[PDB]
Amino acid sequence: XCYXAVCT
Amino acid sequence: XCYXAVCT
């Protein structure tokens, strides 16, 4: 649930 | 370093 440093 | 289920 991440793309790079951005997560949910 | 990861995007979806892929880590680079």
Side-chain angles (χ1 to χ4, degrees):
Chain A
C2 302
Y3 284 84
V6 175
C7 300
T8 189
Chain B
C2 305
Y3 306 84
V6 180
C7 299
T8 69

PDB file of all heavy atoms in Angstrom:
ATOM      1  N   UNK A   1       0.812  -1.205   0.000  1.00  0.00           N
ATOM      2  CA  UNK A   1       0.000   0.000   0.000  1.00  0.00           C
ATOM      3  C   UNK A   1       0.852   1.266   0.000  1.00  0.00           C
ATOM      4  O   UNK A   1       0.376   2.326   0.422  1.00  0.00           O
ATOM      5  CB  UNK A   1      -0.878   0.054  -1.257  1.00  0.00           C
ATOM      6  N   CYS A   2       2.062   1.184  -0.554  1.00  0.00           N
ATOM      7  CA  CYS A   2       2.881   2.361  -0.765  1.00  0.00           C
ATOM      8  C   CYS A   2       3.290   2.472  -2.239  1.00  0.00           C
ATOM      9  O   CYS A   2       3.556   1.468  -2.898  1.00  0.00           O
ATOM     10  CB  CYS A   2       4.183   2.353   0.027  1.00  0.00           C
ATOM     11  SG  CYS A   2       3.980   2.209   1.826  1.00  0.00           S
ATOM     12  N   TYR A   3       3.435   3.729  -2.687  1.00  0.00           N
ATOM     13  CA  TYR A   3       4.225   4.048  -3.880  1.00  0.00           C
ATOM     14  C   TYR A   3       5.310   5.003  -3.376  1.00  0.00           C
ATOM     15  O   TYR A   3       5.033   6.171  -3.068  1.00  0.00           O
ATOM     16  CB  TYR A   3       3.411   4.678  -5.025  1.00  0.00           C
ATOM     17  CG  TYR A   3       2.584   3.639  -5.742  1.00  0.00           C
ATOM     18  CD1 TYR A   3       1.339   3.254  -5.263  1.00  0.00           C
ATOM     19  CD2 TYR A   3       3.065   2.981  -6.874  1.00  0.00           C
ATOM     20  CE1 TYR A   3       0.594   2.238  -5.872  1.00  0.00           C
ATOM     21  CE2 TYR A   3       2.330   1.963  -7.480  1.00  0.00           C
ATOM     22  CZ  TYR A   3       1.094   1.578  -6.974  1.00  0.00           C
ATOM     23  OH  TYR A   3       0.418   0.575  -7.579  1.00  0.00           O
ATOM     24  N   UNK A   4       6.540   4.486  -3.250  1.00  0.00           N
ATOM     25  CA  UNK A   4       7.605   5.291  -2.707  1.00  0.00           C
ATOM     26  C   UNK A   4       7.293   5.601  -1.224  1.00  0.00           C
ATOM     27  O   UNK A   4       7.030   4.712  -0.435  1.00  0.00           O
ATOM     28  CB  UNK A   4       8.942   4.563  -2.821  1.00  0.00           C
ATOM     29  N   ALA A   5       7.348   6.897  -0.895  1.00  0.00           N
ATOM     30  CA  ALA A   5       7.206   7.352   0.483  1.00  0.00           C
ATOM     31  C   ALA A   5       5.789   7.671   0.876  1.00  0.00           C
ATOM     32  O   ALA A   5       5.609   8.197   1.987  1.00  0.00           O
ATOM     33  CB  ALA A   5       7.991   8.722   0.624  1.00  0.00           C
ATOM     34  N   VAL A   6       4.847   7.394  -0.013  1.00  0.00           N
ATOM     35  CA  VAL A   6       3.438   7.700   0.143  1.00  0.00           C
ATOM     36  C   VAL A   6       2.661   6.392   0.327  1.00  0.00           C
ATOM     37  O   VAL A   6       2.715   5.489  -0.515  1.00  0.00           O
ATOM     38  CB  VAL A   6       2.916   8.468  -1.098  1.00  0.00           C
ATOM     39  CG1 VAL A   6       1.397   8.672  -0.987  1.00  0.00           C
ATOM     40  CG2 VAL A   6       3.629   9.774  -1.233  1.00  0.00           C
ATOM     41  N   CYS A   7       1.927   6.284   1.441  1.00  0.00           N
ATOM     42  CA  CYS A   7       1.368   5.010   1.883  1.00  0.00           C
ATOM     43  C   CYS A   7      -0.048   5.186   2.455  1.00  0.00           C
ATOM     44  O   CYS A   7      -0.378   6.203   3.040  1.00  0.00           O
ATOM     45  CB  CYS A   7       2.244   4.428   3.014  1.00  0.00           C
ATOM     46  SG  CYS A   7       3.975   4.120   2.551  1.00  0.00           S
ATOM     47  N   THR A   8      -0.809   4.092   2.354  1.00  0.00           N
ATOM     48  CA  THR A   8      -2.107   3.940   3.020  1.00  0.00           C
ATOM     49  C   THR A   8      -2.165   2.579   3.699  1.00  0.00           C
ATOM     50  O   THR A   8      -1.301   1.736   3.478  1.00  0.00           O
ATOM     51  CB  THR A   8      -3.264   4.158   2.047  1.00  0.00           C
ATOM     52  OG1 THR A   8      -4.499   4.213   2.740  1.00  0.00           O
ATOM     53  CG2 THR A   8      -3.375   3.085   1.011  1.00  0.00           C
TER      54      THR A   8
ATOM     55  N   UNK B   1      11.592   2.282  -1.196  1.00  0.00           N
ATOM     56  CA  UNK B   1      12.048   1.562  -2.374  1.00  0.00           C
ATOM     57  C   UNK B   1      10.965   0.652  -2.952  1.00  0.00           C
ATOM     58  O   UNK B   1      11.259  -0.096  -3.893  1.00  0.00           O
ATOM     59  CB  UNK B   1      12.569   2.504  -3.461  1.00  0.00           C
ATOM     60  N   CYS B   2       9.735   0.699  -2.442  1.00  0.00           N
ATOM     61  CA  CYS B   2       8.700  -0.207  -2.913  1.00  0.00           C
ATOM     62  C   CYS B   2       7.496   0.559  -3.449  1.00  0.00           C
ATOM     63  O   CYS B   2       7.144   1.642  -2.999  1.00  0.00           O
ATOM     64  CB  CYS B   2       8.273  -1.160  -1.803  1.00  0.00           C
ATOM     65  SG  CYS B   2       9.645  -2.092  -1.066  1.00  0.00           S
ATOM     66  N   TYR B   3       6.877  -0.084  -4.449  1.00  0.00           N
ATOM     67  CA  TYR B   3       5.790   0.496  -5.220  1.00  0.00           C
ATOM     68  C   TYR B   3       4.813  -0.657  -5.467  1.00  0.00           C
ATOM     69  O   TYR B   3       5.153  -1.617  -6.161  1.00  0.00           O
ATOM     70  CB  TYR B   3       6.308   1.014  -6.577  1.00  0.00           C
ATOM     71  CG  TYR B   3       7.467   1.972  -6.469  1.00  0.00           C
ATOM     72  CD1 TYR B   3       8.766   1.498  -6.357  1.00  0.00           C
ATOM     73  CD2 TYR B   3       7.264   3.357  -6.530  1.00  0.00           C
ATOM     74  CE1 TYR B   3       9.850   2.350  -6.361  1.00  0.00           C
ATOM     75  CE2 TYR B   3       8.348   4.215  -6.558  1.00  0.00           C
ATOM     76  CZ  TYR B   3       9.638   3.719  -6.494  1.00  0.00           C
ATOM     77  OH  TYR B   3      10.693   4.588  -6.619  1.00  0.00           O
ATOM     78  N   UNK B   4       3.622  -0.613  -4.862  1.00  0.00           N
ATOM     79  CA  UNK B   4       2.744  -1.783  -4.972  1.00  0.00           C
ATOM     80  C   UNK B   4       3.442  -2.966  -4.308  1.00  0.00           C
ATOM     81  O   UNK B   4       3.843  -2.899  -3.159  1.00  0.00           O
ATOM     82  CB  UNK B   4       1.379  -1.528  -4.300  1.00  0.00           C
ATOM     83  N   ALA B   5       3.562  -4.081  -5.031  1.00  0.00           N
ATOM     84  CA  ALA B   5       4.287  -5.242  -4.487  1.00  0.00           C
ATOM     85  C   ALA B   5       5.723  -5.358  -5.000  1.00  0.00           C
ATOM     86  O   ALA B   5       6.382  -6.380  -4.788  1.00  0.00           O
ATOM     87  CB  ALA B   5       3.556  -6.587  -4.788  1.00  0.00           C
ATOM     88  N   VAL B   6       6.238  -4.327  -5.639  1.00  0.00           N
ATOM     89  CA  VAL B   6       7.561  -4.406  -6.248  1.00  0.00           C
ATOM     90  C   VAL B   6       8.527  -3.510  -5.491  1.00  0.00           C
ATOM     91  O   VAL B   6       8.257  -2.331  -5.282  1.00  0.00           O
ATOM     92  CB  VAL B   6       7.525  -3.974  -7.714  1.00  0.00           C
ATOM     93  CG1 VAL B   6       8.912  -4.074  -8.335  1.00  0.00           C
ATOM     94  CG2 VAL B   6       6.541  -4.834  -8.499  1.00  0.00           C
ATOM     95  N   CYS B   7       9.698  -4.053  -5.136  1.00  0.00           N
ATOM     96  CA  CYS B   7      10.708  -3.264  -4.478  1.00  0.00           C
ATOM     97  C   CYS B   7      11.961  -3.191  -5.353  1.00  0.00           C
ATOM     98  O   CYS B   7      12.410  -4.196  -5.902  1.00  0.00           O
ATOM     99  CB  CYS B   7      11.072  -3.849  -3.120  1.00  0.00           C
ATOM    100  SG  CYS B   7       9.671  -3.919  -1.956  1.00  0.00           S
ATOM    101  N   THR B   8      12.540  -1.989  -5.441  1.00  0.00           N
ATOM    102  CA  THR B   8      13.625  -1.742  -6.384  1.00  0.00           C
ATOM    103  C   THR B   8      14.989  -1.583  -5.720  1.00  0.00           C
ATOM    104  O   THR B   8      15.971  -1.386  -6.437  1.00  0.00           O
ATOM    105  CB  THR B   8      13.353  -0.463  -7.209  1.00  0.00           C
ATOM    106  OG1 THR B   8      13.462   0.619  -6.314  1.00  0.00           O
ATOM    107  CG2 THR B   8      12.007  -0.502  -7.903  1.00  0.00           C
TER     108      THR B   8
END
